[PDB]
Amino acid sequence: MNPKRIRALKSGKQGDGPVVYWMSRDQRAEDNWALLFSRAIAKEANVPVVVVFCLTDEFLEAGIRQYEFMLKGLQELEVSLSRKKIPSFFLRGDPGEKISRFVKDYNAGTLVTDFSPLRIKNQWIEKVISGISIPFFEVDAHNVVPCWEASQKHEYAAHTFRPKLYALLPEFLEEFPELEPNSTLSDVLETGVKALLPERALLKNKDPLFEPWHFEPGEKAAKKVMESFIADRLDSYGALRNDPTKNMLSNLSPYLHFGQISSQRVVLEVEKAESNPGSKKAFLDEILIWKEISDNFCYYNPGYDGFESFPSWAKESLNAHRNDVRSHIYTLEEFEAGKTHDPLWNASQMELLSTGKMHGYTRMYWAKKILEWSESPEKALEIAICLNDRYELDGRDPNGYAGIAWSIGGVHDRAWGEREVTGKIRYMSYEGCKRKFDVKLYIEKYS
């Protein structure tokens, strides 16, 4: 019930009707600070709470793999909310128009939303703010420490962000109070899939590349992955996280991205787990430090998807090497289909296509080779964002814009030895990787 987790977006006259939670990022009933705030507001006002989610015009920019994972999540979610006597309302169109009408049509007293630093979410907040007059808040349901309270500027390195975040953990890492009760999606899933079908990813024989069985969706399937990580894989996490031949990661990012599970719930469960001291340190650095510095990156950098947000040393170094002859230059088409000269890059591209989740270690190798085989850093940023958002279940996400800005621009990194083309940007070599794991097995597994 910490008030540091909320920000007033607009302040206006409180209406006589239900409190309305505009679900955007945190698509779950449990462990959701934004749902809990909206309910407490409704308790004080002697009104019910309702959930509204807007299905936007932008799903045609992604693929069936994301569209189905999210909707099957929401189908389980509607049931779970109704059992707590919370109705959920799904709107087709974009939020500026559809939230505004719902607020005026149902006489809402207060409007609430969850936090996301992304540009599109800011776009929608701007349209909505104009079209309403009731008060408007946003809660950070997605970070353990509220993005605005973690740091008041862009943190340039993880080593400066780490002591700030761990200092506030004692106040913000706490158990979740239970969600108090109050006192179709099948049609839109099928409609969307037909609109999306002519863009479905196929591999020549028209049989589809995506394998929808590696990650079942929704809050229920998320707990089991979290429970199976701690039970089975956390012990070994600290050593094998950088070996893509043996999947010992959490596998939580798809669920974290759609907000089907709270990173705070994950940190709570990992804290009390008695595992290897160093695996827990490694794991907590990723879900606390690197995930939440990625929200810090997008919140404090309007140009988080452009060259301009690169650090100075990195921009002038890449600018120094702009006219360096590239060893190869591939188009978007060849990158996508996986038709470069590097079998390791290509197998990584296929793990992304077949499963929707590239191993984290080769996500680094994959993105940096795009900087190497592109005409410019600006083209390399485009190509990485496009393929990352199109094919990753966990993409269209701060961790993606930050993970690419790290790979291609040295954001949250430091200068390395100066090379042709890529300047001082940390370099990763095919020879380097086989020294680090069994590179042939990875290739064979994705052929």
Ligand X SMILES: Cc1cc2nc3c(=O)[nH]c(=O)nc-3n(C[C@H](O)[C@H](O)[C@H](O)COP(=O)(O)OP(=O)(O)OC[C@H]3O[C@@H](n4cnc5c(N)ncnc54)[C@H](O)[C@@H]3O)c2cc1C
The one segment of 67-75, 83-91, 253-261, 301-309 that binds ligand X by CB under 6 A: 253-261
Q: Does 388 bind ligand X (CB under 6 A)?
A: yes
Q: Which is nearer to ligand X, 92 or 159 (CB)?
A: 159
Q: Which is nearer to ligand X, 15 or 244 (CB)?
A: 244
Q: Does 291 bind ligand X (CB under 6 A)?
A: yes
Handedness of CA 7, 12, 18, 23 (dihedral sign): negative
**What are the φ/ψ torsions at residue 291 (nearest 5 degrees)?**
-65, -45
**Residue 251 known to bind ligand:** yes
**Residue 399 known to bind ligand:** yes
- The minimum distance between CB 171 and ligand X, in angstroms, equals 22
Q: Which of 212, 14, 233, 46 is nearest to 111 (CA)?
A: 14
Q: Does 249 bind ligand X (CB under 6 A)?
A: yes
Question: Count of CB atoms within 10 A of residue 239's CB?
Answer: 14
Q: Kindly tell me which residue out of 32, 143, 250, 264 binds ligand X, with binding defined by CB under 6 A.
A: 250
* Chain centroid offset of residue 388 CA: 11
What gap in Å lies between CA 414 and CA 135, rounded to an integer?
44
Q: Which amino acid is it at 183?
A: S
- Whose tokens are 């000269």? That residue is 341
How many positions of this chain bind ligand X (CB under 6 A)?
A: 28
Cα Rg of the chain (Å, integer): 22
Q: Where are the alpha helices (DSSP H) in 305-438?
A: 312-320, 332-337, 343-355, 360-372, 377-391, 398-409, 430-434
Q: For ligand X, what does the binding mask look like between residues 395 and 434, x meaning CB under 6 A?
A: x-x-xx-xxx--x---------------------------
Q: Does 252 bind ligand X (CB under 6 A)?
A: yes
Q: Does 286 bind ligand X (CB under 6 A)?
A: yes
Q: Which is nearer to ligand X, 91 or 273 (CB)?
A: 273
Q: Kindly tell me which residue out of 90, 360, 378, 379 binds ligand X, with binding defined by CB under 6 A.
A: 360
Q: For ligand X, what does the binding mask look like between residues 198 and 237, x meaning CB under 6 A?
A: ----------------------------------------
**HSE-CB for 387 with a 13 A CA cutoff:** 26
**Residue 407 known to bind ligand:** no
- The minimum distance between CB 105 and ligand X, in angstroms, equals 36
SS (H, E, C) 58-73: HHHHCCHHHHHHHHHH
Strands 19-23 and 49-55: parallel
The one segment of 78-86, 152-160, 244-252, 330-338 that binds ligand X by CB under 6 A: 244-252
- Catalog residues that contact ligand X under the rule CB under 6 A: 241, 249-253, 256-257, 286-287, 290-291, 294, 360, 363-364, 367, 388, 392, 394-395, 397, 399-400, 402-404, 407
